[PDB]
Every structure is written in structure tokens, then in C-alpha cells.
Design a binder for this molecule. Structure first.
Ligand SMILES: [Mn+2]
Length: 261
């Protein structure tokens, strides 16, 4: 009964933040707008470079996809790692984060979707920081069930049946979701729209495929508003159920191509 995903004793309030993808400036703006105070620490290095506090004792929940695409990936990492360490944040992993971990561990993965930017930015940092990043990503839990089971956070979402489960299949769902088993017009796999079929008790806040505006469906909401693509970085305030966002300062990266159909 003792899984890592159980944080039911954590009641918040929480500010839940979608995919950052290296957008440090917007992250800093959003945290400040939420009332967090960010101190650039004197002499501070790596995960000790920053210290974040909140006078109302609010906590941040990051939905992952911290790395790739954007201009300030190592600063995002330093900030988020420090927050998790000081206890003001938790983080669940995105697909990009885990793929980065596999690459740093020695797997010869495809350099795509912004990973080149992470690698070239990481290259400018010392080695002990690189090991800190590996340790950080390796310890990320697939999802968290929080606040007496009233809230679930996961990167790609978490359908009811899998909530609170620690199996390998549940971790894959958190990272990637699942496919429907059938193919599309190109004979390719199709993503399963789990949120449409969701009837679970917990509100699920997640950040899967990027959207122009938050996508609320049944007791679920996707808050990846595509900051790095020139959209915005969104926080969802819990239990207030309020949306707070910061517009991207620039278009840092081009979004996926779109089929005509
Ligand atoms: Mn993403």
C-alpha cells in the first residue's frame, strides 16, 4: 500500500505549472505573479543558485517537460531542482525529461524535438551538475495522488484505473498516455482520448499535447498552453481552481506540423 505516488497527506494549496521546455524567463514571471519570491543566492551554484519562498505557504507542482526547445534549459533545471530540494515543489516527469535521462545514461537516442538545445546548453555546465540532473530525473515519481485523493497530477494524465498504482504500465501512461490499438489513415497508432472517458473522483491536472487554451474535460484539465511555441505558460491554482498565465516573450520553437486531412 506504500507507493511513492501516495501524497494524500499533502493538502496544498498548490500552483500546478505546465510544460516549461526551457522557458526560464516566463517561469520566473509566472512564479512572481503567483506571489513566490525568488532569491538569486550569493555564491549559489547549480541547485543552490536560487531559493524560492511563498508567504502564504503555497507549493508548486511541476508537470514536467522542463527540458528541450527553449533558451534557458539549465536555469530552469537549477530553479526546479532547488525548489524540490527546499520542499516548496514537487515534480512529475515528462517524456522529454526521461528521454534526456536515458541519453545522459549512455543511450544513443534520436536527437529530436529540441533535445539538441538541451545538450548544447548542458555542455556549458560542469559535470557534478550533470550528475545532479541525472539523480534528480531518476527520482521523479510517475504521478502523485494528493489531498485525500481529490487531486492527481501527471504529465500525460492518469485514467482512473491506474491512479495510485505503481506498475511500469502506469508510469508509461504518465509519460506518453496510451494508444487505442487501431491505426489512422496513415496506418499509424492513434492516441487514446482517456479524458473523454474519465469518470474518476480526483481532479486530474496534466499537460499532454499542447493547446492554445486550457482544455477542461470532465474532472480533468490539460494546462500545457505551449509556452515555448509562442503560447503561454499556465499555472492552475488548487483548490481555488483558478487559471493564471504569462504570455511567452517570443516564439522560441516551432510547433508540430499539422496534417491537412
Ligand atoms: Mn511537452
Amino acid at each position: 500500500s506504500m507507493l511513492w505516488n501516495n501524497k494524500k497527506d499533502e493538502h496544498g494549496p498548490f500552483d500546478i505549472i505546465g510544460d516549461i521546455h526551457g522557458c526560464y524567463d516566463e517561469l520566473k514571471m509566472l512564479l512572481e505573479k503567483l506571489g513566490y519570491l525568488i532569491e538569486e543566492v550569493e555564491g549559489g551554484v547549480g541547485s543552490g543558485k536560487y531559493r524560492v519562498t511563498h508567504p502564504e505557504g503555497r507549493k508548486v507542482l511541476f508537470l514536467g517537460d522542463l527540458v528541450d526547445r527553449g533558451p534557458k534549459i539549465t536555469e530552469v533545471l537549477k530553479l526546479v531542482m532547488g525548489m524540490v530540494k527546499s520542499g516548496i515543489a514537487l515534480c512529475v516527469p515528462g517524456n522529454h525529461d526521461v528521454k534526456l535521462l536515458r541519453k545522459l545514461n549512455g543511450r544513443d537516442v534520436q536527437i529530436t524535438h529540441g533535445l539538441d538545445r538541451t545538450l548544447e546548453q548542458l555542455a556549458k555546465e560542469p559535470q557534478e551538475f550533470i550528475e545532479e540532473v541525472k539523480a534528480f530525473i531518476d527520482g521523479l515519481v510517475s504521478h502523485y495522488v494528493l489531498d485525500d485523493g481529490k487531486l492527481v497530477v501527471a504529465h500525460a494524465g492518469m485514467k482512473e484505473e491506474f491512479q495510485g498504482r505503481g506498475s511500469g504500465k502506469v508510469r508509461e501512461f504518465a509519460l506518453y498516455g496510451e494508444t487505442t490499438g487501431e491505426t489512422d489513415e496513415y496506418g499509424l497508432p492513434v492516441r487514446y482520448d482517456w479524458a473523454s472517458d474519465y469518470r474518476g473522483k480526483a481532479l486530474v491536472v496534466y499537460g499532454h499535447t499542447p493547446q492554445a487554451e486550457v482544455l477542461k474535460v470532465n474532472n480533468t484539465i490539460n494546462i500545457d498552453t505551449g509556452c515555448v511555441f509562442g503560447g503561454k505558460l499556465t499555472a492552475y491554482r488548487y483548490p481555488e481552481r483558478e487559471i493564471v498565465d504569462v504570455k511567452a516573450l517570443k516564439t522560441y520553437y516551432e510547433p508540430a506540423l499539422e496534417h491537412h486531412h
